[PDB]
């Protein structure tokens, strides 16, 4: 087994095709299924896996009450093969209310954060063994990507933030070998969706304070230098945001439109164009769409989209989304998952909060239309 290098061009992409769906909530009405949130997908060279942060309980369970709380000592990182729902046989790979995972070509790395809000601990588990650990540096809720990290030549990069102070850690076989502070014009960086862009790593993240345009972080694996900006596209990708006719953007600064909230999302470049996903509803996490914005990676005045696809209808709930990359015979493909959140507090028919997932992958072929929502009937679940 050799280290992954991702030294292949990005695949030609006309859009995205259906890949996977777990139907987790529908199954939990007749079976013991974990309560989860913040899921993501990552693949080793052989097969793909779905991850999620459990709540230490199943859904049909007295302990599923009040699972809207995001930090508890009972949250663990769940790992299953993609398509296997989180049943009672699921492996909890570490203790975590925030996490990131990636495969360097030889073994799995898990970054797992747990503990007190003012004094959290990030554990670094490589090939099933704890190798390193680091304490919160700002003493104010240490958190990380909630999606896959990226490894190149045995060096894995993960973005972590503390307090409102964002750092980029370089990990070799579980050992922190270098730490770089976030540099550039991105003012707030959270929950980065990173992907290999040889010879470096590119991340599209979430600005939870000042902008509805997503920040970008570029990581150089060789000299550990960091540069950061914002996605130029005049069609911004965060939620909440203004409508398409009145929204604006900027390549270096946050747009100062609908700050104070956000949602984890993704985008990746295709020449001067950008592929991105976002919620259809501009204010709430309803629906999910993907499209390409021509000149969207380099022109902040561009609002010309093409190749739109509805992933979730505007009347159905979505949630977090992120990117994962897969190495093919000749090119690196881009895929993404969508978290489909159900329950409290937006839905009062039940006492719990959980999610299912739907997964799409880039295609060079052709495709049609559809909608793949969670599909559970909360009114009937009691």
């Amino acid at each position: 087994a050799e280290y992954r290098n991702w030294s292949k061009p990005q695949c030609g992409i006309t859009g995205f095709a259906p890949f996977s769906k777990d139907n987790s909530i529908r199954l939990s009405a007749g079976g013991d299924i974990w309560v989860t949130r913040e899921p993501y997908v990552s693949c080793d060279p052989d097969k793909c896996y779905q991850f999620a942060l459990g709540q230490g309980t199943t859904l049909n369970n007295v302990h599923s009450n009040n699972t809207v709380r995001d930090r508890t000592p009972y949250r663990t990182l769940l790992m299953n093969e993609l398509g296997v729902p989180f049943h009672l046989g699921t492996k909890q790979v570490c203790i975590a209310w925030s996490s990131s995972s990636c495969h360097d070509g030889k073994a799995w790395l898990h970054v797992c954060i747990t503990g007190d809000d003012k004094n959290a601990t990030a554990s670094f588990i490589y090939n099933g063994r704890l190798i390193d650990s680091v304490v919160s540096w700002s003493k104010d809720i240490l958190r990380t990507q909630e999606s896959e990290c990226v490894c190149i030549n045995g060096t894995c990069t993960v973005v972590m933030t503390d307090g409102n102070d964002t750092k980029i850690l370089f990990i070799e076989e579980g050992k922190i070998v270098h730490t770089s502070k976030l540099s550039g014009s991105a003012q707030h960086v959270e929950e980065c969706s990173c992907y290999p862009r040889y010879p470096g790593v590119r991340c599209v993240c979430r600005d939870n304070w000042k902008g509805s345009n997503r920040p970008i972080v570029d990581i150089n694996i060789k000299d550990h230098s960091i540069v950061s900006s914002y996605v130029c596209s005049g069609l911004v990708g965060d939620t909440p945001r203004k409508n398409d006719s009145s929204s604006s953007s900027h390549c270096l600064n946050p747009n100062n439109e609908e700050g104070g909230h956000g949602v984890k999302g993704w985008a990746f470049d295709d020449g001067n164009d950008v592929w991105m996903g976002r919620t259809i509803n501009e204010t709430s996490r309803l629906g999910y769409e993907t499209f390409k914005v021509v000149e969207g990676w380099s022109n902040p005045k561009s609002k010309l989209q093409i190749n739109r696809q509805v992933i979730v209808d505007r009347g159905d709930r979505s949630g977090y989304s992120g990117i994962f990359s897969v190495e093919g015979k000749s090119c690196i493909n881009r895929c993404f998952y969508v978290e489909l959140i159900r329950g409290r507090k937006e839905e009062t028919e039940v006492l719990w909060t959980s999610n299912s997932i739907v997964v799409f992958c880039g295609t060079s072929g052709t495709y049609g239309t559809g909608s793949w929502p969670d599909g559970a009937d909360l009114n009937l679940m009691h």
Partner: antibody
Framework: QVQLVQSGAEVSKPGASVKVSCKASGYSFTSQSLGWVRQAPGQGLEWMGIINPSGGITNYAHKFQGRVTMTRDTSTSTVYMELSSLRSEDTALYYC??????????????????????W | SYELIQPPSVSVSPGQTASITCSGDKLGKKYTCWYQQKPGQSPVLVIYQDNKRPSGIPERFSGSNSGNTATLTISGTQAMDEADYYCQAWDSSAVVFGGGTKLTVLG
């Protein structure tokens, strides 16, 4: 120039209901949660609940569950507090507050505790 | 339901250092706030996140939270500092206030 201006004083009969309003300005209305703290004459502060103007989700203190309704109108940058089944011990000064905290109970992914910076 | 315990009254002389405590079960694990209410006006946030001062708050006001007690400290107290002081924390997202402490600058 952040400020909250509240409605005028009210006298109400026991058993009825009272509705107080509060207009926010100096910042984007949808960016921060707004709440209500009351103070009986000569007593301490007592939190009633909060509303997130982005989504309208509310979170009330247990003592007032079933008695209070908080609403928001984003077009007018105004929140309201309606307390029903009024009793004599509801005589108090009712403060409108801006809570910079992020509560899971009103739609935030990561809970974050700050405090009430504007009254 | 969680409860915060404050002394009802604390007295100092001009220029002295006042210390107001606030006690609760494992209070050091949680975030605390301090509010200053002068007679006739609304409360004012003087300390948030255990020891942070909002811009415009004098640096005489300091805060600390360790173990089971939170403490607000006012060095070189002036007459204008006479007010009621409330500690504040959270119990499962529910805001909780201390009973309040009357601060008197002895005249």
């Amino acid at each position: 120039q952040v400020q909250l201006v509240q409605s005028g004083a009210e006298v109400s009969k026991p058993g009825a209901s009272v509705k107080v309003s509060c207009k926010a300005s100096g910042y984007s209305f949808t960016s921060q949660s707004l709440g209500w703290v009351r103070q009986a004459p000569g007593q301490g502060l007592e939190w009633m609940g909060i509303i997130n103007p982005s989504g309208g989700i509310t979170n009330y203190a247990h003592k007032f569950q079933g008695r209070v309704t908080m609403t928001r109108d984003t077009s007018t940058s105004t929140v309201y507090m309606e307390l029903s089944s009024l009793r004599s011990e509801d005589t108090a000064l009712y403060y409108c507050v801006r809570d910079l905290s992020h509560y899971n109970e009103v739609g935030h992914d990561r809970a974050y505790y700050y405090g009430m910076d504007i009254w | 339901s969680y409860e915060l315990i404050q002394p009802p009254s604390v007295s100092v002389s001009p220029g002295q250092t006042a210390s107001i405590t606030c006690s609760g079960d494992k209070l050091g694990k949680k975030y605390t706030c301090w509010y200053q209410q002068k007679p006739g006006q609304s409360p004012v946030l003087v300390i948030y996140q255990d020891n942070k001062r909002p811009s415009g708050i004098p640096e005489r006001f300091s805060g600390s939270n360790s173990g089971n007690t939170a403490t607000l400290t006012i060095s070189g107290t002036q007459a204008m500092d006479e007010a009621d002081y409330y500690c504040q924390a959270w119990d499962s997202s529910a805001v909780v206030f201390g009973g309040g402490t009357k601060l008197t600058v002895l005249g």
